[PDB]
Write a protein that binds this ligand. Structure first.
Ligand SMILES: *[C@@H]1O[C@H](CO)[C@@H](O)[C@H](O)[C@H]1NC(C)=O
Ligand SMILES: *[C@@H]1O[C@H](CO)[C@@H](O)[C@H](O)[C@H]1NC(C)=O
Lengths: 126, 111, 75, 495, 75, 50, 99
């Protein structure tokens, strides 16, 4: 079926810029919207936001709505999540997931199986 | 936003028995919307969707996993606990504001 | 200007809602009402003119309505 | 089972002797077709892409004037000459200003003056045109029986998408367990492209009338320009000031984006950020039911117990959807579903999900049925373990007939003569109604084109009064009927 | 919109050139001319209605001109 | 009435009856526009999104 | 002289932070905290809701959307006190003298 491969683990100094790609194959990239989930080692999953590949529309979480930016390439078949101001709290594995958008390309209401496929995971230790 | 999804931190059950995991949330996400999804995460493995609806489940997942939702609480029920059910289980919901809330997580351990 | 020639009567209207249908459904009538409120003098004169020019109550009312609607739009 | 949630859902019941039915797939509307011994199918028009549109005319909405220059003549000496007058990108105007000894002339009168400023365009609204050729529709056909999920099949989905372009009239869709549905669609007459402009102002695009677009009072380029400087009708976006008949000046007259937004009132917006997607307009198709097979036929009835995994829900169209799960032997069997009266003596309710079946033991198939008005019983399963679920349908029958008549009127208002091809199976009444509608609609479009809804209501009232006062009753009835229809159209217009 | 309330008739007029005076003197009349050119069907029906409404000849022409002026400007 | 780089002498009731968002004139912060709906459009086609 | 501004009008606006909240059928209208913020423009409407949307009831669900209204350009309407007018006149005797 569909497969998503995230990038390798990155260890960065606090305050640096992070950027981890999640290339997803086996399906129309612009058809589905790709979400980003963060989980501090030994803590809960934490939802960052989603980037719609169809038209670039994005949504970030309240917590991340300042230092977190999500962008995707339609041709590169990859979506990128970048964290602006790093901190020790930010040392977690970031997971990319996927949710299909409606027939019109809008992403108002998600599909009930909104995280059916994930990425293997990329670990960043800030 | 905030981890409104509150579920028991630790859960254990003897192999072959039925164990239930309850996920509680506000009326915004888990009490009003059927977007309650249960995800199982193995050690070092990415989360796997177990029940996409309140009770629906994917093709790969075995039928031992059955969920339910009453009021503002969502429940994951596992019938016939095995030794492969020792992974964590994260409930999630689509908040009325358009965001996603994950549960604290339940670490299932079988004896 | 362009705003003075809207796309309202074109006949290309589907079941899908148009650009400012909700807003512009009553904008013209609201503007006529506001104009009558602000400029009461012309309304009375138009009523008198319609009464004089119309033999029947239908003619008078129709003429008065037309005069009242034309004055603001004509500006 | 897409149509369940949609408010604008139409039920088309019946096929012709040839097992075909014609439908109109409007955007934002879902059609469900029910035929005896035929699977119930849900048809939705989800996209209308117009490809490779050619630019027709560029309009200037925000300009800027520069390089202003003036020349004057003494009175009675003709007009002055500015070298910039030769160039067509300079907007120039001739006026007369008082002259005399004080301003250097030997005569007291009005000397000619010419003001020239270079016109430049900051923002323009391209208007493109498409030819029906590159007009590709997209339709989704979902087998209405099964369970309504798009994650059941990894490669695709239960529903099928067929692209209806004018190149191929026949589009044949193969449903996994339902055979094949054939749509003989007609894309060329759905929307009158080539009498229509794809207007695109900044990051918003509309679908405007070609004549209306060409009548816009703004500077414009032909649409084949390369230099892009020789604007036509520049003086619509420029003001010339000769305030006290002493000097003349030229101003640029601001930006017309907001005025254009106001002008576009009444035009259905579309998308042009990628591919010129249209989400409006209808499509007329013919259904080929001949090769459609019920997915679960040649199954044995299910004799085990059934449980309701999802509470019976009253859908917006007067039907009910209930999800049930089967716990019994004989995995692939057909569900015994019935809707009877309180005495269990009659089968009062029809089943929209015809031939419900249990594909997999642990799979909650969901069922849509139409119960009768009032109290009834939804019975699922055989006598040992059979579920009796009482239901009350809130409405009435006469109310439903009134609602159906109003829905048909609204279809006759949104659509033209196509309202006569929505539910038709051939027949002389359909053909005659369509022909009469074509004639009366030609007359009505000629009479009421370019008129606002308020004017339509005023004309309807006037015609109703004229008919009410006519001395001849034949003319009286005709006039009142025309006025009433006109009033209704005025009330329903501005959609 | 704001352009539909043009400040044309508010008094306050001196012997100095006002904003867009020459341009805007006949622009509404020219708009009506273009609209009547593009929509001759409505003009015929307006003439018929004016003839059938009002008995005197003066009345009919007053109604016809009023209707043809309101139609395009009703927006 | 001073717009961007040009000014006019206009009637005061006409100015107070314009259909545009307006501040009372003493607002330095400009965070309380009135009549904001005259300069925005809310679109709900097909009753699916807004 | 000394003109005082009585009203500022916005002629070119801007919408930046759009947020939306949806309610399932028969539950009334939803709530946004931006809805009572004065620098946000909000509107209530109804969208079709159902099992696919995630509700569990079939009907119209209330919807609210809000965007922050920002003015990029405005027109200042100023007023002058009649005591602050200062007319200037030139009286030249029509003498015939040259400059
Ligand atoms: C217009 O003026 C600019 C200076 O702003 C100058 O560079 C340009 O050559 C001038 N063009 C003409 C045609 O006068
Ligand atoms: C609005 O979005 C901008 C985007 O950069 C952000 O900086 C700002 O904090 C947001 N304001 C809100 C959400 O109130």
């Amino acid at each position: 079926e569909v497969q998503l491969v995230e990038s390798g683990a990155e260890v960065k100094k606090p305050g640096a810029s992070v950027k981890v790609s999640c290339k997803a194959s086996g399906y129309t990239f612009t058809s589905y919207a790709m979400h980003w989930v963060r989980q501090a080692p030994g803590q809960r999953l934490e939802w960052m936001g989603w980037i719609n590949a169809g038209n670039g529309n994005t949504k970030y979480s309240q917590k991340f709505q300042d230092r977190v930016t999500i962008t995707r390439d339609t041709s590169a078949s990859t979506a990128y999540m970048e964290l602006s101001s790093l901190r020790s709290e930010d040392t977690a594995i970031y997971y990319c997931a996927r949710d299909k958008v409606d027939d019109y390309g809008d992403y108002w209401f998600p599909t009930l199986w909104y995280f059916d496929y994930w990425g293997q995971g990329t670990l960043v230790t800030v | 936003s905030q981890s409104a999804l509150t579920q028991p931190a630790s859960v254990s059950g003897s192999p072959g028995q039925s164990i239930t995991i309850s996920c509680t949330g506000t009326s915004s996400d888990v009490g009003g919307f059927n977007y309650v999804s249960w995800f199982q995460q193995h050690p070092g493995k990415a989360p796997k969707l177990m029940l996409y609806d309140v009770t629906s489940r994917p093709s790969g997942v075995s039928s031992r996993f059955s969920g339910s939702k009453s009021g503002n609480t969502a429940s994951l029920t596992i019938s016939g606990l095995q030794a492969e059910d020792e992974a964590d289980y994260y409930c999630s919901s689509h908040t009325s504001r358009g965001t996603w809330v994950f549960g604290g997580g339940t670490k299932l351990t079988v004896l | 200007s362009v705003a003075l020639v809207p796309h309202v009567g074109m006949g290309l209207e589907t079941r899908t809602e148009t650009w400012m249908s909700s807003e512009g459904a009553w904008k013209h009538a609201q503007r006529i009402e506001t104009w009558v409120l602000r400029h009461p003098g012309f309304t009375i004169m138009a009523a008198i003119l319609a009464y004089t020019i119309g033999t029947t109550y239908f003619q008078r009312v129709l003429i008065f309505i037309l005069l009242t609607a034309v004055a603001p739009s004509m500006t | 089972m897409r149509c369940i949630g949609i408010s604008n859902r139409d039920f088309v019941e019946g096929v012709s002797g040839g097992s075909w039915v014609d439908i109109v797939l409007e955007h934002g509307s879902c059609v469900t077709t029910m035929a005896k011994n035929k699977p119930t199918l849900d048809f939705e028009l989800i996209k209308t892409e117009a490809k490779h549109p050619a630019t027709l005319r560029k309009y200037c909405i925000e300009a800027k004037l520069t390089n202003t220059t003036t020349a004057s003549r003494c009175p009675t000496q003709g007009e002055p000459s500015l070298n910039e007058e030769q160039d067509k990108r300079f907007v120039c105007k001739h006026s007369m200003v008082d002259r005399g000894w004080g301003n250097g002339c030997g005569l007291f009168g009005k000397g000619g003056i010419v003001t020239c400023a270079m016109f430049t365009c900051k923002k323009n609204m391209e208007g493109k045109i498409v030819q029906p050729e590159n007009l590709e529709y997209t339709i989704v056909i979902t087998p209405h029986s099964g369970e309504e999920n798009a994650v059941g099949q990894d490669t695709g989905k239960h529903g099928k998408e067929i692209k209806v372009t004018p190149q191929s009239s026949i589009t044949e869709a193969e449903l996994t367990g339902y055979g094949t549905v054939t749509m003989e669609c007609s894309p060329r007459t759905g929307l009158d492209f080539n009498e229509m402009v794809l207007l695109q102002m900044e990051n918003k695009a509309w679908l405007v009338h070609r004549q209306w677009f060409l009548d816009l009072p703004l500077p414009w380029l032909p649409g084949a320009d390369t230099q892009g400087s020789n604007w036509i009708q520049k003086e619509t976006l420029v003001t010339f000031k000769n305030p006290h008949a002493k000097k003349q000046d030229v101003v640029v007259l601001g930006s017309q984006e907001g005025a254009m937004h106001t002008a576009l009132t009444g035009a259905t917006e579309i998308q042009m950020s990628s591919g010129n997607l249209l989400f409006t307009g209808h499509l007329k198709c013919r259904l080929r039911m001949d090769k459609l097979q019920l997915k679960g036929m040649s199954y044995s009835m299910c004799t085990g117990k059934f449980k309701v995994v999802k509470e019976i829900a009253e859908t917006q169209h007067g039907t009910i959807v209930i999800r049930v799960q089967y716990e019994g032997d004989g995995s692939p069997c057909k569900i015994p579903f019935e809707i009877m009266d309180l005495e269990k003596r009659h089968v009062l309710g029809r089943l929209i999900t015809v031939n419900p079946i249990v594909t997999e033991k642990d799979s909650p198939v969901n069922i849509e049925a139409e119960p009768p008005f009032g109290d009834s019983y939804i019975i699922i399963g055989v006598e040992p373990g059979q579920l009796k679920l009482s239901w009350f349908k809130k409405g009435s029958s006469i109310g439903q007939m009134f609602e159906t008549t109003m829905r048909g009127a609204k279809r006759m208002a949104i659509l033209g003569d196509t309202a006569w091809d929505f539910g038709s199976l051939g027949g002389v009444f359909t053909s005659i109604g369509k022909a009469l509608h074509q004639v009366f609609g030609a007359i009505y479009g000629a009479a009421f084109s370019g008129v606002s809804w308020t004017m339509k209501i005023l004309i309807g009232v006037v015609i109703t009064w004229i008919g009410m006062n006519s001395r001849s009753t034949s003319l009286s009835v005709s006039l009142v009927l025309v006025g009433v229809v006109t009033l209704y159209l005025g009330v329903m217009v501005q959609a």
